[model samples]
Target: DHMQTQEIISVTLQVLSLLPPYRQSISVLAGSTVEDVLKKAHELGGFTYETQASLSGPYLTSVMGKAAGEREFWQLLRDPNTPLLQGIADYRPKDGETIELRLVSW
Candidate 1:
């Protein structure tokens, strides 16, 4: 199980590098929300759901920018009623900017 997790993390990093670079690097504070990240991305010129069909989807999309839908995916990221959002928050860099999220295991 650990090995699988490591593999997934490795692949995730590789995939993240492929995302278009962000216009600027966003500083996500200790207690930020998913909405905050999305807003920051917008401020930095990242494509929003309405502007780019490629960024719209039902579930959370990978670096692909496609998700099932905005509500469902944001719910998964921000719902306190669910465990998914617990202790988790991330910054989505604007398009054309690169973010390095580290993955390490021993």
Candidate 2:
């Protein structure tokens, strides 16, 4: 009830799929950032990948064991115009906001 820094927040993850059913949601407590949610979901999201993340960026070579092609890449989103929040590790989520990661093609 008093002023506190830590609290539980709901975060959502979405993987861009041609079909439906590409969403994962979890409740993460304070002290946990957007990156934390991904780390947790990496294990429970029923997918396979070479790397989860790094200082450079998040490296996901494959999803669900299917290798990502050269044309395909990952695109991150927070919402609206908050593009300054680059790295997932640096963006902290609030109670009602949703964070998304989509496989995109250029």
Candidate 3:
């Protein structure tokens, strides 16, 4: 059996804190997802962005000038080499883990 009634977790969101085209050594929530990380970035005054909902599903496709079906993409990743199997919508970060959201060309 398992019961729940407590509160204690370090939730911090870190990302490119610079003005873009730069990398700032990248917190987060208990059940926070990658999408939330973007919001976190916004608060950190990181860069510019937004998401779009498609018939298939919602996705992140723009940052700094890169867009899908055009050239390049945000390229969400769990670590560095670990490209996320899921989109930002479900790309949840672990406790005390630093998430990366770097922009690049295709």
Candidate 4:
């Protein structure tokens, strides 16, 4: 589950960086809309926005305006506390252009 989540998040960040406005602050902790991120990601052409939206359910429970469930899945993606998505919103990327999703297992 962790690996899957990280992979998705990594992909999400890559897609988010492609946007013109977000291009400058790709990994920086700045306010960005879920639609903005998803749209940019769709342009990259690796994964479907629907797939990404589906994967966000479990991770976005608290962040979403509504509770966690099939109905609130999209809401969660919009939320800023959804794991890797949140990181993108909170932390600045060291490389400036690349957002690395490093995984450490214990």
Most accurate candidate by TM-score: 2
State which candidate has the highest lDDT. 2
Score residue 54 of candidate 3 by CA lDDT. Answer: 70
At residue 48, candidate 4 shows an lDDT of 34
What is the number of residue pairs that collide in model 1? 14
Per-prediction TM-score, please? 0.29, 0.65, 0.62, 0.24
lDDT of 4 at 69: 46
RMSD of each: 14.7, 4.0, 4.6, 14.4
What would you estimate as the lDDT of candidate 4?
0.31
The sequence of per-residue lDDT tens digits that candidate 3 reaches over residues 45-88 is: 46456678976456777664445455656666555546678887
User: Model 3 residue 16 lDDT?
Assistant: 46
Model 4 ranges off by over 4 Å: 1-31, 51-106
Candidate 4 per-residue lDDT over residues 66-103, each given as its tens digit: 23344433222221333334422233222223432222
What lDDT score is found at residue 87 in candidate 1? Answer: 17
| Weakest ten-residue segment in model 1 by summed lDDT | 5-14
Candidate 1 vs candidate 3, lDDT winner: 3
Q: Tens digit of lDDT per residue, candidate 2, span 1-106?
A: 6555676777776655535646777677765766677767777776444546666776555554556578986556765423334666666777766666656677
Error of 3 at 105 (Å): 6.0
Candidate 2 ranges with C-alpha deviation above 4 Å = 1-5, 18-20, 43-49, 52-57, 79-84
